[PDB]
Amino acid sequence: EDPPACGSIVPRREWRALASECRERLTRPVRYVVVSHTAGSHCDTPASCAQQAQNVQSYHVRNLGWCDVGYNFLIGEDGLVYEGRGWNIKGAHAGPTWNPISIGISFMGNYMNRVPPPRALRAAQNLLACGVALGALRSNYEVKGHRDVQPTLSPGDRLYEIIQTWSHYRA
Amino acid sequence: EDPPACGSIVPRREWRALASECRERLTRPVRYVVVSHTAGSHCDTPASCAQQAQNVQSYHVRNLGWCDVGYNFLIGEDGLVYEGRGWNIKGAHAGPTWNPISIGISFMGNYMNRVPPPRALRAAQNLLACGVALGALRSNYEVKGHRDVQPTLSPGDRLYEIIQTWSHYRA
Amino acid sequence: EDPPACGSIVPRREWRALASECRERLTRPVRYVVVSHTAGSHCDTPASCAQQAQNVQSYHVRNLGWCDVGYNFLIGEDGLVYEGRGWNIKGAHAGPTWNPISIGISFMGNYMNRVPPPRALRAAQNLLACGVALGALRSNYEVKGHRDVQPTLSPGDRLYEIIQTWSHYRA
Amino acid sequence: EDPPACGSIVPRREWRALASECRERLTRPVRYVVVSHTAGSHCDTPASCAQQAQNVQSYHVRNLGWCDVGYNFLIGEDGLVYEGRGWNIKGAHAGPTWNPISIGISFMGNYMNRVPPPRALRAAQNLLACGVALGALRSNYEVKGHRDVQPTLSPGDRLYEIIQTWSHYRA
Ligand SMILES: CCCCCCCCCCC[C@@H](O)CC(=O)N[C@H]1[C@@H](OP(=O)(O)O)O[C@H](CO)[C@@H](O)[C@@H]1OC(=O)C[C@H](O)CCCCCCCCCCC
C-alpha cells in the first residue's frame, strides 16, 4: 500500500531474461523465505552474473519446462540481486508444500565448501528488508534453508551455517 | 546476530580503506544530497571498484592531506555503493556552504561524455532510500548536482542531465 | 494391538477457522501437555464457543501475525474441544523450549476467579486419553501448568489448583 | 565528555539479586521496547519494591530455571527503576522473536484495573530517555505493549491504554 523505492535489483530485461509465462500469484504478505543455492557456477561481475542468471533460467525453462526461472530472486557474488519471478509470483524452488507460501531466493553457486562473499549476503538480506517494506513479506517473516524443507544439501553447508545466524531464521 | 543496514554498502574495511581521522558530525536528518563524479577512472567489478575507492581515498588522504576520502559515499559501475565518510560524518566534497548540510555521493568515473550504467544509478537510489529509512536524510531530501553548488563540471554533463530528472532533484 | 478411534473434537472448518500457515511438526509420541487459559471471555454453547475460538485465533493470526491460533486444542465451557493446531503441528503456547515437545491445550475464559465447569474438565481429560489412544501422546505423558514453564498467571489459580491433582501432573 | 548521564537505577546488588548467569547479548542501539506488567502485586515503597524484584527473579530463576529474571528492567510504584538483565543482555520477556531485538520493561504489579502512579510512569519514561541518551536504544525506538507481541493480558488494560499514547508507541 506504501510507495517508496528499496534495494537495487537487476531487472529481468537487463539480464536478458526470456519472458515469463507464470501467472499463479502468491498471497501477500508472504510468511516464508527459503534460501537455496543453485549448486551451479558462481560469478563475480555484473556481466558474468547476468549471464549466470540467464543460464539458470534457460535450464529451468528450456529443460525443466517451467514457466520461468524457478526462483523469485537470485543473488550473485557480484553483490547484485537478479529479479526472478519477483515478489508476486509463486516460484518453483522448494516443493509443492513450500512453493505456494514462500519467496525463494537462490545464491548462484555451490556453497558446500565456499561461502558467498559478504556483498552477496548483504544484498540478500537487504532484499528481504525491501520485501517487508513493500508488504510482499510479513514483518515477521521466517527464513529457512532449503534443507529445512526438503532433503537436499542446498543451500550448501557453509551458506546454511551463515543463514542460521540471520535475524529471521527459524529452522 | 544483527541485520546489515540498508543500501548494500561495501564497508570501508572491505575496500581496505585507510582509517578515517574525520570527526565532524552532520546534523541529521540531512536536507541535501550533492551528486558528483570523481572525474577519475571508472571500474565495473567489485574487485576493481574496491581498488578504485582505495585509489580515490589515497589521493585525498595522502596527497590532499584530508582526514578521509571526501565523499560520504562512492558509486561504482559494478552497481555497488562504497562507504566513504558515511551518513554521520561531514564530508569534503561540495565546499564550505554545502559540506555541513548534505551527503555527498560520487560516481566513480568521468561522466562528461558517458553515463553510469543503470546499475550504478539504481545503487545511488537504493542508497538514498536507505538514508531516509535510517533517519540520516529527511524524507523530502533535495538532490543537487555538484555544479549547482560549486563552479565545476562535476558530476559530468551526461550524469548531470540524468540527475536533473530525479524526483528529489531541485534546481 | 491396532488403530482405533476416539476424538469428539470440533473440526477447524466447523468453527470456521482461518487456514493455518503453520508447518513445523511435533514428534509423536509427545511427552508433555501444557495447560493454559486464554485469560479471556468464556463461552458455554457451541455457537458461542465456535465464535470464541474464532476470536482467539483472530487475535493470534491477525494481531500477533502468527501462522495459526497458538494452541493445539482449545477447551470450551460448552464441554466441547476445538481443533487448534492439532496433534501433529507444533504450537505456539509455551515458549521455545516447550513448544517442540508439548501439546498445548487452552481453556477458553479466565480461571483466576473461576473453575471451568465439569464438562470442560471432562472434555480435556477425554482429549488427553484420546491422544494416548492415538499414539499422539506418551501413555505416561506429563501435564504442566503454563505457569510452571513460562512467567504467567495462566492457566489461572483455580484451574492450576485442579491440574496439580491430576494423575499425569508432574510438578 | 561528562561521565554521568541519566541513570538512577537501583542496582542488582542493592535489591539483592542472585548473580545472573545470562550471556547472550543484545545489539545496541536497540529498536524496540516491550512493556509488560508482572501481573502480581505491586510495591510502593523502596523497601517493598526491592523485595518484589527479588521475588520475581526467584520465580524466573528458581522455578523456571532461567539464567536471570527475564526483564531488562522493572518499574516499582515507589517511582524507582530496578535493574534486571539491563541494557545489554537479551531478556526473556516477549518470546523468541522479540527478545533478541528489544528491551523488556515490566511494571511491578497488575494493571488490568489499576493504573501505575505518576512516579512509576515517570520512572519508565526517564529510563527510556536514558536509554536513548546512552546509545542503548535508537532515537526512534518503538514501544509495543506485551499483548501486541505475545498472547497475554500484559501489560494490563489500564497500562496498555497509557502506553498507546506515548510518543514512541507503534502497535
Ligand atoms: C520468552 C519468554 C516470554 C514470556 C511468555 C509469557 C507467556 C505469555 C505469552 C505466551 C507464550 C507463547 O507465545 C510462546 C510461543 O509460542 N513462543 C514462540 C515460538 O516457540 P518455538 O518453540 O520457538 O516455536 O513459537 C512461534 C515461533 O517462533 C512464535 O509464534 C512464538 O513467539 C514468537 O516468536 C512470535 C512473536 O511473539 C510475535 C511476532 C509478531 C508480533 C506482532 C507485533 C506487530 C508489530 C509489528 C512489528 C513490525
The cell for B147 is 555544479
* Ligand 1 neighbour C66 (Cβ under 6 A): yes
List helix spans (H) across chain C. Answer: 46-58, 118-134, 157-163
* Ligand 1 pocket: which of C25, C66, C67, C146 to mutate (most atoms within 8 A of CB): C66
Nearest to A88 by CA among A68, A72, A105: A72
DSSP state of B59: I
Strands C81-83 and C73-75: antiparallel
Query: In chain B, where are the structural domains located?
Result: 1-171
CA distance B97 to B31: 13
d(CA D102, CA D28): 10
* Closest C-alpha among B168, B156, B62 to residue B109: B156
Q: Is C96 on the interface with A (CB under 8 A)?
A: no
Q: What would the grid cell of residue C72 be? A: 493445539
Q: Give me the DSSP letters along D93-119.
A: SSHHHHGGGEEEEEESS--SSSPPPHH
Expressed in percent and rounded to 5, the helix, strand and coil fractions of chain A are 35, 20, 45
With beta carbons less than 8 A apart as the criterion, state whether A127 and A73 touch: yes
CA distance C33 to C149: 11
Buried b (16+ CB within 10 A) or exposed e, D9-47: bbebeebebeebebeeebebbbebbbbbbbbeebbbebe
Task: Give the Cβ contact number of residue C151 at 10 Å.
Answer: 26
- CB crowding A82-119: b at 16 or more within 10 Å, else e: bbbbbbbbbbbbbeeebbebbbbbbbbbbbeeebbebb
Cβ–Cβ below 8 Å for D100 and A167: yes
Q: Does C65 contact A101 at a Cβ distance shorter than 8 Å?
A: no
**CA of D150 relative to ligand 1 center, distance in Å:** 5
C152: contact with D, CB 8 A cutoff: yes
CA distance C103 to A65: 43
Secondary structure (DSSP) of C35-71: EEE--S----SHHHHHHHHHHHHHIIIIIS--SS-S-
Residue C21 Cα to chain centre, angstroms: 18
What residues are paired with B50 via a beta bridge?
A: none
Backbone angles phi, psi at B62, to 5 degrees: -70, -40
- CATH number of the domain located at residue range(s) A1-171 in this protein: 3.40.80.10
Answer for the pair D12, D69: CB distance below 8 angstroms, yes or no: no
Closest CA to C37 of C154, C120, C161: C154
C-alpha distance from B140 to closest chain D C-alpha (Å)? 18
DSSP for residue B101:
G
Report the neighbours of B using a cutoff of 3 or more CB pairs below 8 angstroms: A, D
CB B36 within 8 A of CB B107: yes
Interval between CA C96 and ligand 1 midpoint (Å):
9
- Tell me the β-bridge partners of C104: C34
**Do B123 and B111 touch, CB atoms closer than 8 A?**
no
Which residue's CA is the nearest one to ligand 1's atom 21?
A: C96
Any atom of ligand 1 within 6 Å of the Cβ of C70? yes
In chain B, which residue's Cα lies nearest the Cα of D140?
Answer: B135
Q: What angle do CA A140, A144, A149 make, to 5 degrees?
A: 130
- Residues for chain D: how many in total? 171
Cα C73 from chain centroid (whole Å)? 4
Nearest to D78 by CA among D20, D10, D16: D10
Residue A129's Cβ-side half-sphere holds a number of Cα atoms within 13 Å equal to: 24
- Cβ of residue C38 closer than 8 Å to a chain D Cβ: yes
Report H helices in chain D. Answer: 12-15, 46-58, 95-98, 118-133, 146-149, 157-163
Q: What are the E-state strand segments in B71-145?
A: 73-75, 81-83, 102-107, 137-145
Give the H/E segment covering residue A132.
Answer: helix A118-134
* Ligand 1 touching residue C93 (CB < 6 A): yes
A63 in contact with chain D, both atoms CB, cutoff 8 A: no
Q: Assign C15 to helix, strand or coil.
A: helix
Q: Resolution limit in angstroms?
A: 1.7
* Torsion of Cα atoms, B113 then B117 then B120 then B126, to 10°: 120
Give the number of other CB atoms < 10 A from CB of residue B98: 18
Nearest CB among D96, D148, D152 relative to C152 is that of: D152
End-to-end CA distance of chain C: 32
Is A97 close to ligand 1, i.e. is its CB under 6 Å away?
no
